[PDB]
Design a protein around this nucleic acid. Sequence first.
DNA 1: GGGGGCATGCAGATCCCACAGGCGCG
DNA 2: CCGCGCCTGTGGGATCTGCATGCCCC
Length: 281
Amino acid sequence: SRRESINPWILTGFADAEGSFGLSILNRRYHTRLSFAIVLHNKDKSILENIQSTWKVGIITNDGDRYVRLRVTRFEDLKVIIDHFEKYPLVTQKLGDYKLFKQAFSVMENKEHLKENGIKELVRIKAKMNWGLNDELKKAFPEISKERPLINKNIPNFKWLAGFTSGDGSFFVRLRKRVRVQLVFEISQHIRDKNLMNSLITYLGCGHIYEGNKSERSWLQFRVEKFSDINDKIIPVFQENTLIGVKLEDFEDWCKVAKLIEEKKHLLDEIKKIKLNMNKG
DNA sequence: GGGGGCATGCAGATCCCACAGGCGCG
DNA sequence: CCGCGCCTGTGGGATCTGCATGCCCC
Ligand SMILES: [Ca+2]
Ligand SMILES: [Ca+2]
Ligand SMILES: [Ca+2]
Ligand SMILES: [Ca+2]
């Protein structure tokens, strides 16, 4: 059960990709709940165990027949999470949800949430957090601003990038029809972090940003399709900065196809065998 | 007696992932 | 011609996010 721990910057990078900070204010006088959660497919339960071993907090639960959840609600345990992200701060817009989550923690640590003044402040905090206030709290506390300080941060290091890639990244092989094999690396992200995704082009020395129609599409792609860039830049980066989860296994199969491509790929039966065991198994 | 915290289960919403096709260029 | 890589496009599920209840304890 007790599995390996992970580098704390890799964990923050995975949290930037897959984490969620929650502030629930329900009328059971109001009940206050703070939470951190990650939901993944069972294939990546090892990641949740890795985080649980590194933080030494959190409950791992099956969220159905297909999914697994790591959830932290115990108040003292949320202090462990604050201390981690204070030393290893998030990079995406989720940092703002973390900061509001931390602000809510100080209201509750000072027991102010038991009185009416604390609830009003917690409602103001929740308004700027994630998807904002629900209809009931919008009516019961109409005083309601969703605006919050802007975030525009740079990639802190490659260890963060490995955890981020383990979450939102993708390694795959294309078989285009004469059949040619092409390696592709892609990270997708909501356009709310376009600057950070643009940051990747010079940070990795390769790649392009693709957006489609910016007026009707809320997410973009950072992609590297040039084999020399995959072979000389992306592979050495993630070989030195270990990925986690099945993304690591997909990367290792990905690199097997890369060695074949640098050795005159065209023969192809072994590449098709590796591809069958990638994002299908 | 019960307020408040914790665990728990489930549902809503969407941002991802893992791709494919057309075609200009060296 | 051939192999490549820019560029455009996306289904649908793995995510992110949120709601509700029960039971314990000081
Ligand atoms: Ca993400
Ligand atoms: Ca993310
Ligand atoms: Ca993921
Ligand atoms: Ca993700």
